[PDB]
Each structure stands twice: as structure tokens, then as C-alpha cells.
Amino acid sequence: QANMQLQQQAVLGLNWMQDSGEYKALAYQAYNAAKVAFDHAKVAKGKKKAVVADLDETMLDNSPYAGWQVQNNKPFDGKDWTRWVDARQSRAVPGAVEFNNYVNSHKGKVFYVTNRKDSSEKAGTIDDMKRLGFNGVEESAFYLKKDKSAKAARFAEIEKQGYEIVLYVGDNLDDFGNTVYGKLNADRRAFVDQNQGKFGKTFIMLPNANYGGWEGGLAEGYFKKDTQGQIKARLDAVQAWDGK
């Protein structure tokens, strides 16, 4: 079964994210850099400091859902995801709560720009964030997904309210704008090169070895491929020594 082969390929990275001190250190590193950036951030007169944050694998830890997929040879499925969200068992990414709370209590506002669904996933999301200790989780802080997954229009909506976004936090390049949304990894790496100086300053990265736009970035129409095609795409993407 290709589905088992697909989820087994995620095991080592899942162990790293769930179990390693190294992952935790990377999360602390990101949020420590984020505080410094925020502290230094200069905003135009008349504007207020905004911080834009992704949720999944940035502030909220959904790794147990991935663990359930590994244990049950399951592809990603929307109804399964909703059930996870409603299960209200999300954990916090290390450092995220303290950073969020720091911003909101020091002349800033964190906005949660997230592709959790506004219709069916808002309630579980807000419940979890409250439980985990995130302050300022009132309804208006969230820009949840309606139809589109691209985020720039939501960022623009925030700027319309007289905020200047000083920082973007995420685990996916698409958490920083639309430049490479739906693009292959060559283009995505190019964007990173073009913006090298922004990382750990304006664009704050969290690690995610399990899923993301980089996964779709492995091949044209990757997400339209069947499990075998995705497996083939992954294997074809491997850069290998000739052993000589």
C-alpha cells in the first residue's frame, strides 16, 4: 500500500519535531529573534505595530494528528482534520504564547492569519488558544480561511485598519506573502535568496519537516497526484551522491 509508504516517509521528521530538544531550541530561537525584531521595529507615524502570525505549526502544535496518520496509514483528509480541531487537544509551539503575550502587552497586536476554516474550525481554535494561554484571542484577532488559502489579501485588510505589520511569523514561505504561493521549490528558494536579509528579522521561520507548500513544491500538480505520484515525486527530488 502506497499510503503506508507515504506516511512512513514522515516518521523520522515527526520524531524530530515531537521528541527532540533541537526542535524546541529552534522554536525558542525563532521567538527570541521575533522579540528582538519587534523591540527594534519602527512604524510610520499614525500607525500601530502589528505582528502577523500563522497558527498551524507556528503557534499551534498539531503533531499528534500527524502521529495518528502514521499509526493508521492515513492521507490528509479534511473531515479528519476538523475532528482533530474539535478534539481541542492542540499544543503550543514552544515560545509562541510568551511571544504573543509580550507583543500584545507592549504597544502591539498579534493577528492570527490562518487557513483553519472560519466556519467549522474557529470554535476549537479559539478554545485551544485560550486554554494554552494566548491573550487577545477575541474574534477580531483572527483572519480565518473563507475560500482562498493565499494570505496577502488578509495582510492587506490588517493594514487598512491603520496597522503597520512589523513582523510575519510562520513555518511556510506563504506565511510571508503571495510571491511564491503555488510555485515549485526552485522559485521558492529563489524568493528566499532575494529576501535573505529579512529572515530572523521581518520574516520569522519555524521548522516543519512534515508538510507544507514545500511538499506541493516537489513537482508540478503534486497535490493532484495519487499517493504513488507523490511518493515518486519525493524520491525523484532526492539529490544523491554517486557513492564513488
175 is in an annotated binding site: yes
Site string for a second copy, 186-205 (x = CB under 8 A): --xxxxxx--xx-xxx-xxx
Stretch that binds a second copy, among 41-49, 99-107, 154-162, 231-239 (CB under 8 A): 231-239
From 7, 27, 57, 125, residue interacting with Mg ion (rule: CB under 5 A): 57
Q: Which amino acid is at 151?
A: K
Q: Does 171 bind Mg ion (CB under 5 A)?
A: yes
Report in angstroms how near the CB of residue 174 gets to Mg ion at its nearest: 9
Query: Footprint of Mg ion on residues 82-121 (CB under 5 A)?
Result: none
Q: Does 19 bind a second copy (CB under 8 A)?
A: yes
Q: Does 42 bind a second copy (CB under 8 A)?
A: no
Beta carbon nearer to Mg ion, 57 or 61: 57
Q: Does 158 bind a second copy (CB under 8 A)?
A: no
Stretch that binds Mg ion, among 3-11, 58-66, 72-80, 223-231 (CB under 5 A): 58-66
Q: Does 1 bind a second copy (CB under 8 A)?
A: no
* CA 35 centroid distance within chain: 18
Stretch that binds a second copy, among 44-52, 131-139, 143-151, 170-178 (CB under 8 A): 170-178
Q: Does 56 bind Mg ion (CB under 5 A)?
A: yes
Query: Which option in a second copy, Mg ion, none does residue 46 bind, with CB closer than 5 to 8 A by kind?
Result: none
171 is in an annotated binding site: yes
Looking at the DSSP assignment, which residues form a beta bridge with residue 165? 50
Asked if 170 and 53 count as a contact pair (C-beta separation under 8 A), the reply is yes
Q: Could you list the residues known to form a binding site for Mg(2+), using ranges.
A: 54, 56, 171, 175
